[PDB]
Design a protein around this ligand. Structure first.
Ligand code: 3PE
Ligand code: LFA
Ligand code: LFA
Lengths: 55, 470, 162, 113, 100
């Protein structure tokens, strides 16, 4: 049962989590300028709303 | 406030670079000579770098209702000037293969260096805006210098549209800030508030729009999506300049703005910048895991390093060595990015695969692996000294989430930086003194990284000498 | 004074709404010129006489002339522009409009929560603006000249025909 | 005061009457006169791609018009600015003329090839 | 007697309308038009802020704003001219070769 080193896979779980998160986050870099402007406006809305909530 | 001769001698790098712009422009008007115009630009930038000595002996004073000169301004002016000099040195062998006019490149580099010096010396919203635009617009020209190429034109269009949007965002932000306060000086941004009422909504919204513009300009999440495309599509000396000089000047003016303003110690602004820095570190490190292109990888690296910079930014009002940490980190990051993008430029020159680089270009492979160890914060490198400074500043102010983000992003950066540095030595299937000069530039950059990673005390003393006014 | 300000602001808002929802580039530029004239009227209502004079001299007299020049040289007959109308298609525009809407409500919340003693409308002449421009703002003038020079060099290098 | 508001009323009447005059000129021209049809009447009169130099000329007009606005702001306040402002404007015009000479010598302002 | 808040509201409305036109339009010319609207709205806000405090700083910042607007319009229209010259279209979604 232990010949496949289960604790090694348990600590390799963060590696596959990082790989999956990077692959998911790379979908935002679609290369479209209109999406880049939309993301800038989204960040502006998020920053302004966070500043108004925490004030 | 009027201008005195002492104020003129405080204006020395700005005046020298402007005179260099005029002289190079008139020399281009006389006769298109690539070598002589490049020599004039390098001579002017080196003259400003030398005249920083006279600026230092002039003392720290206020020249304008806009500008303030101190050791902080000298340090950032020197960083911007060194980045511009390296950009010209890398650009000459690349421009040897350009069929169209090559002489406008150095004019644009000089104007962008002028904007960087203004941003270093900026103590006003007008000077901040004009320095940002004076950096941005020559970079619009330089990114799309090879406009016949698909990638360069695409990157130029993206950078121009997005930076115009960020400029409008920033300008509306200072418009709201000036509507609240009534003075555009850095020291008066919130000075008319007391009794714990610093968090006025209009001032906070104006600073938030300013954060939107500057976080575009600093490749901070979520205004970071332009960085890999603009870094890849632009010419490699332009990528070098955009990685080093623009980021350093804009972060220096953000440092000065958040030190001097009374609103800079607001809790909501601190939490928003903590979120931005955390997301910037994590996203920039995660998105560079599977990049086979060196330029996009270094763009995501720039995002991560600016996240570490913002972590050092947040503890400005609490800690005491936050500016010293920022200066040490920025010197190390300038050296590392200059070396890495310079080897990329020398492999992309002249204008017409990093695997197996050691078997035909061993010196450049060694310089590249030194800088990719440096950007990973490996000891015996100056990037490690910068990361140690960032971690010490984070530990002092009890920014534990930021410290954990730095550690995790450092592990992910270690993965991809070592992947490239060991792909250098695998197996895969010039002849002018300017190319040798670029090789000498990247070699001295690597030697400086190694020496100041083993012996960081002179750089620490130099940065501690560059103390701004209290 | 206030009546002219509110009428000009309403005209500018409606004209800008017409620009951002139009298919003809020349009609959009004409509505943009009309909005610039209205914002100039707003500037003249607030006592910033030089600002309105520069809006019609420079913004409505040089920059929009350049835009109209470019649209003339493109000969834009609406190829795959009028035949698409994708901005008028709802599921494209619902998102960004609600984004700008919530941003507008946040900015309005910021604006309404500030002290307002009113604008007295005292006329600020161009002489005082010139005194300030060549007084406490001299590096701004010289580096703005350098910025215009940089834009000159950049757009000459890009916009050649050969 | 009464004089300033009377001046404002006179200016408003001037603008309104001028606009109404050209509008009524159009109304009279369109309403009066008989209309008749021909086959080639609707065809444009053509006696039975544009270069980028137009864009360059308009661009130079825009840039030098912004520097002209700077000199407009200077010229109305020349005496209060003193010799210092004269030196600043001399530097400004020196940069302007250097850019103009650079545009001249590289053939940017040369229409003919 | 004009409230500062109403002028700031007008400038914000024009700013967000320019941003909407910048986002929802594929044509690069309309995005340049929207960018001009945003920077002109920011200049309007700065003029209103300068006029409330009785200072020339608002008009000076307006002058810097329109200098940036003129030079940015010049550069953006040069880029649009080259895009139309070599691509024969103004679709900004078509130039998306660099991704990931
Ligand atoms: C009538 C209903 C609407 C009909 C359709 C639209 C017609 C045009 C409406 C806008 C223009 C006219 C607005 C009304 C102005 C009347 C005069 C006025 O209100 O003057 C007040 C003030 C005078 O100066 P001030 O010193 O402030 O006065 C205080 C008293 N001593 O004045 C000022 O300070 C400045 C006055 C305004 C600025 C000058 C005029 C600007 C014109 C902009 C036109 C924009 C394009 C319009 C296109 C219309 C068709 C689509
Ligand atoms: C991805 C990086 C995660 C870092 C987690 C760090 C957690 C720190 C918790 C500190 C709690 C302090 C309470 C007072
Ligand atoms: C081909 C590429 C097309 C890209 C189009 C991009 C459109 C972006 C639309 C964004 C809509 C946001 C809606 C609101 C989201 C929630 C509120 C803001 C974040 C808190």
């Amino acid at each position: 049962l232990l010949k496949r080193d289960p604790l090694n896979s348990m600590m390799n779980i963060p590696a596959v989590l990082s790989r999956f998160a990077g692959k998911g986050l790379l979908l935002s870099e679609n290369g479209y300028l209109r999406w880049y402007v939309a993301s800038m406006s989204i960040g502006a809305v998020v920053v302004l709303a966070l500043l108004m909530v925490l004030r | 406030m009027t201008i005195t001769p002492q104020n003129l001698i405080a204006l020395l790098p700005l005046l020298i670079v402007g005179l260099t712009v005029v002289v190079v422009m008139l020399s281009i008007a006389w006769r298109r000579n690539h070598f002589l115009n490049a020599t004039l630009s390098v001579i002017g930038l080196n003259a400003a770098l030398v005249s920083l000595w006279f600026v230092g002996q002039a003392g720290a004073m206020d020249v304008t209702p806009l500008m303030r000169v101190d050791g902080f301004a000298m340090l950032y002016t020197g960083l911007v000037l060194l980045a511009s000099l390296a950009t010209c040195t890398f650009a000459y062998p690349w421009l040897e293969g350009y069929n169209d006019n090559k002489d406008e490149f150095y004019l644009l580099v000089l104007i962008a260096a002028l904007g960087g010096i203004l941003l270093a010396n900026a103590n006003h919203l007008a000077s901040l805006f004009l320095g940002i635009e004076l950096i941005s617009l020559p970079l619009f020209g330089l990114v799309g210098y090879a406009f016949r190429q698909k990638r360069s034109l695409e990157a130029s269009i993206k950078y121009t549209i997005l930076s115009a949007a960020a400029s409008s965002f920033l300008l509306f932000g200072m418009a709201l800030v000036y509507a609240q306060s009534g003075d555009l000086s850095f020291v008066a941004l919130g000075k008319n508030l007391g009794d714990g009422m610093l968090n006025e909504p209009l001032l906070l919204a104006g600073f938030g729009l300013m954060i939107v513009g500057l976080g575009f300009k600093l490749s901070l999440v979520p205004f970071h999506l332009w960085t890999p495309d603009v870094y890849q599509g632009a010419p490699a000396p332009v990528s070098t300049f955009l990685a080093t000089a623009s980021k350093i000047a804009i972060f220096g003016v953000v440092m000065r703005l958040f030190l001097y303003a009374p609103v800079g110690d607001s809790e909501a602004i601190r939490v928003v910048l903590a979120i931005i820095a955390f997301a910037s570190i994590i996203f920039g490190n995660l998105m560079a895991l599977s990049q086979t292109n060196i330029k996009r990888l270094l763009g995501y690296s720039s995002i991560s390093h600016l996240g570490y910079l913002l972590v050092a930014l947040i503890a400005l009002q609490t800690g005491e060595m936050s500016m010293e940490a920022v200066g040490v980190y920025l010197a190390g990051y300038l050296f590392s990015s200059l070396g890495a993008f310079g080897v990329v430029s020398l492999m992309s020159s002249p204008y017409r695969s990093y695997r197996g680089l050691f078997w035909h270009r061993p010196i450049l492979a060694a310089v590249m692996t030194v800088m990719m160890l440096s950007l990973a914060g490996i000891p015996m490198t100056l990037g490690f000294i910068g990361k140690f400074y960032v971690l010490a500043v984070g530990v002092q102010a009890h920014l534990w989430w930021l410290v954990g983000a730095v550690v995790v992003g450092s592990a992910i950066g270690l993965y991809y930086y070592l992947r490239v540095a060991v792909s250098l030595y695998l197996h895969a299937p010039p002849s002018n003194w300017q190319y040798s000069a670029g090789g000498i530039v990247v070699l001295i950059s690597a030697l400086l990284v190694l020496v100041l990673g083993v012996w960081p005390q002179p750089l620490i003393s130099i940065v501690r000498l560059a103390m701004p006014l209290m | 004074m206030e009546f002219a300000f509110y009428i000009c602001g309403l005209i500018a808002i409606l004209a800008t709404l017409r620009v951002i929802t139009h298919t003809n580039p020349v009609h959009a530029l004409l509505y943009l010129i009309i909005s610039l004239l209205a914002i100039s009227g707003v500037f003249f209502s607030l006592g910033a006489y030089f600002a309105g004079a520069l809006e019609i001299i420079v913004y409505a007299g040089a920059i929009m002339v350049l835009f109209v020049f470019v649209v003339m040289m493109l000969n834009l007959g609406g190829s795959e522009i009028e035949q698409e109308r994708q901005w008028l298609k709802p599921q494209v525009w619902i998102g960004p409009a609600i984004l700008s809407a919530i941003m507008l409500v946040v900015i309005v919340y910021a604006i309404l929560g500030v002290n307002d003693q009113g604008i007295d409308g005292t006329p600020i002449s161009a002489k005082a603006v010139g005194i300030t421009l060549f007084g406490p703002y001299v590096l701004a003038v010289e580096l703005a000249s350098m910025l215009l020079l940089a834009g000159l060099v950049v757009a000459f290098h890009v916009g050649r025909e050969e | 005061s009464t004089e300033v508001i009377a001046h404002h009323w006179a200016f408003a009447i001037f603008l309104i009457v001028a606009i109404g005059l050209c509008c009524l000129m159009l109304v009279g021209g369109w309403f009066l006169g008989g209309r008749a049809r021909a086959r080639s009447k609707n065809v444009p009169f053509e006696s039975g791609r544009l270069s980028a130099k137009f864009y360059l000329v308009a661009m130079f007009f825009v840039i030098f018009d912004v520097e002209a606005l700077y000199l407009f702001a200077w010229s109305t306040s020349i005496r209060e600015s003193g010799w210092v402002g004269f030196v600043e404007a001399a530097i400004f015009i020196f940069v302007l003329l250097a850019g103009l000479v650079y545009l001249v010598r590289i053939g940017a302002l040369d229409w003919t090839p | 007697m004009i409230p500062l808040q109403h002028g700031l509201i007008l400038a914000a409305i024009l700013f967000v309308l320019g941003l909407t036109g910048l986002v929802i339009r594929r044509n690069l010319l309309f995005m340049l038009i929207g960018l001009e609207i945003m920077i002109n709205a920011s200049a309007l806000a700065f003029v209103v802020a300068g006029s409330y405090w009785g200072q020339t700083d608002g008009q000076v910042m307006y002058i810097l704003a329109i200098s940036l607007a003129a030079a940015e319009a010049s550069i953006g229209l040069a880029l649009l001219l080259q895009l139309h010259r070599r691509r024969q279209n103004l679709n900004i979604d078509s130039v998306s070769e660099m991704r990931g």
